[PDB]
Amino acid sequence: ASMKQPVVVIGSGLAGLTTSNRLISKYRIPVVLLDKAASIGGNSIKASSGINGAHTDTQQNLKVMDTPELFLKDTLHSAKGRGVPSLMDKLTKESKSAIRWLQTEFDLKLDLLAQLGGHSVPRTHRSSGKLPPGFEIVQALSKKLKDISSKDSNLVQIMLNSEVVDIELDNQGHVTGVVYMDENGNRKIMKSHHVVFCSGGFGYSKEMLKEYSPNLIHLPTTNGKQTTGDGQKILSKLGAELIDMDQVQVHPTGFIDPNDRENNWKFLAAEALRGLGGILLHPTTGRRFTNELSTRDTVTMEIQSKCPKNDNRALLVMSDKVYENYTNNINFYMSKNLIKKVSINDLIRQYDLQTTASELVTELKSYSDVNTKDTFDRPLIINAFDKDISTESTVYVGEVTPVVHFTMGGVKINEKSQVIKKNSESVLSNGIFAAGEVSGGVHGANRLGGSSLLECVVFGKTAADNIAKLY
Ligand SMILES: Cc1cc2nc3c(=O)[nH]c(=O)nc-3n(C[C@H](O)[C@H](O)[C@H](O)COP(=O)(O)OP(=O)(O)OC[C@H]3O[C@@H](n4cnc5c(N)ncnc54)[C@H](O)[C@@H]3O)c2cc1C
Ligand SMILES: Cc1cc2nc3c(=O)[nH]c(=O)nc-3n(C[C@H](O)[C@H](O)[C@H](O)COP(=O)(O)O)c2cc1C
């Protein structure tokens, strides 16, 4: 393309980093990436379980059979009649290409799998090594932009500490600029004809929770303090449709920090910890109480009903075999006192359980016996406990509690990642796009683990491809 005014990308999470990379590298369209925070990455850079793909090279290598049709089936089942089915079709159909894009353009291995809740087969990809998938992916995409910037400053600029506050439109009805507050709190306008909102969810915002899901306002969150629904609000005021805003995902397993127990913010206990073999024990009885691998709305409901009203937490207990397949991650959690390695005898006392050690042993064994029926219907039992586990055998334990995690609602988009006008199927503006958690309609009533990083890549690429047709 001939260089004109920049495309403004709002937010440097995976949706924004995807959109920017695709614009600059495929089309040589100039980008200005604005983020109101002090650093790149949003909640994306903190993501720990991985990114979904159906029918990938990694699945083939590991002899997992998966299709876009099965992924779509799991996604429609998760959605429970909410959202836009054709966007779920797109999300799942283009996921093979998403994983391939990360592997071929950025040499991300993505060679390991985990099966998360609501998934029929393992399709959540992560790379072997020390780096969790959120950080590995953000790091690689940001490094590419920074390299490109250093060679051609006009092709991409990243501007941090820049909070977008509005979009300016001409008489009817085109984008002419982006209004933002710079590092010094001064109003600035970035002149532009194309803007992509990649500004994330609203899960941290107590006021938006009061408006859309009032019964969640006292729950802790995994979200960073930047997660305040800015783009949703800005776009709704400009006349965009919002959809499914009252669909807020509460993740069942945020870690409790033993030295800061009532912190409103929690580290997340990656769902892979359960997918790869971890179980949940009741915090008083020391006994399993539910299917740990169902969808997040269902596991959370079980914890909130079966664990004590006051003191609503559970014990996440992981075997040596879980540790061997998730070593670096668990080592990290241990470094933050979030997981402790303990003998079964000490587990009983350190967590004030009613069960005897010998009784807990009997339980772990029958859970691990996969020739014995599972009390709670768990669809996948791998890396369970040693058959001759004794009271002095060690396990890994963390304390977990439900947390506000993800907002499925947001601005309505179409298949081109264009923002849809309120009460209409026409676009609000030829130059307004959105991608990632700021958008609504992709997940419906519940998001499958692994599909939010996926959404970022699929719809970020889409926004870039479609701006390229118009630029
Ligand atoms: C602990 C945690 C763990 C997670 N683990 C996984 C996982 O394992 N697998 C998976 O698929 N997903 C996971 N997710 C969700 C996922 O990682 C992303 O958060 C999600 O995909 C949204 O990405 P995003 O690009 O839309 O938004 P974000 O990554 O949140 O980035 C949005 C950016 O927009 C900036 N911004 C916000 N408002 C403005 C404004 N007015 N002006 C300018 N900039 C603004 C923000 O500062 C932020 O940097 C996890 C999320 C969290 C919090
Ligand atoms: C396995 C693993 C899981 C992590 N989980 C979270 C998390 O849930 N929430 C979060 O904010 N950061 C998470 N992080 C990020 C760390 O808090 C930290 O930002 C990162 O390790 C960078 O190290 P630093 O503190 O020296 O900057 C995780 C990191 C790893 C390696």
Author numbering: 31 to 501
Q: How did the manuscript describe this experimental structure?
A:
In order to test the first hypothesis, we added an excess amount of FAD right before crystallization. The shape of the electron density map appeared to be similar to flavin mononucleotide (FMN), showing a clear isoalloxazine ring and one phosphate group. The second FAD-binding pocket was well defined, possessing a deep cavity containing enough space to accommodate the isoalloxazine ring from FAD. Six amino acid residues, including W295, F297, L298, N359, F362, and Y363, from the clamp domain and three amino acid residues, including K76, S78, and P162, from the flavin domain of Osm1 formed the binding pocket of the isoalloxazine ring from FAD. Among these nine residues, P162, W295, F297, F362, and Y363 directly interact with FAD via hydrophobic interactions, whereas L298 forms a hydrogen bond with FAD using a nitrogen from the main chain. With respect to the catalytic mechanism, FAD bound in the second FAD-binding pocket may directly transfer electrons to cofactor FAD because of the lack of a barrier between the two FAD molecules. Moreover, the edge-to-edge distance between cofactor FAD and the second FAD molecule was around 4 Å, sufficiently close enough for direct electron transfer. Taken together, we confirmed that Osm1 can oxidize free riboflavin molecules by accommodating them in the second FAD-binding pocket, which allows electron transfer between cofactor FAD and free FADH2.
Interestingly, a sequence comparison within the Fcc3 family has suggested that both Osm1 and Frd1 contain only a flavin domain and a clamp domain, and thus lack the cytochrome domain, which is critical for electron transfer. In the current study, we provide two structures for Osm1: one in a complex with its cofactor (FAD) and substrate (fumarate), and another in a complex with its cofactor FAD, substrate, and a second unexpected FAD molecule located in a newly defined second FAD-binding pocket.
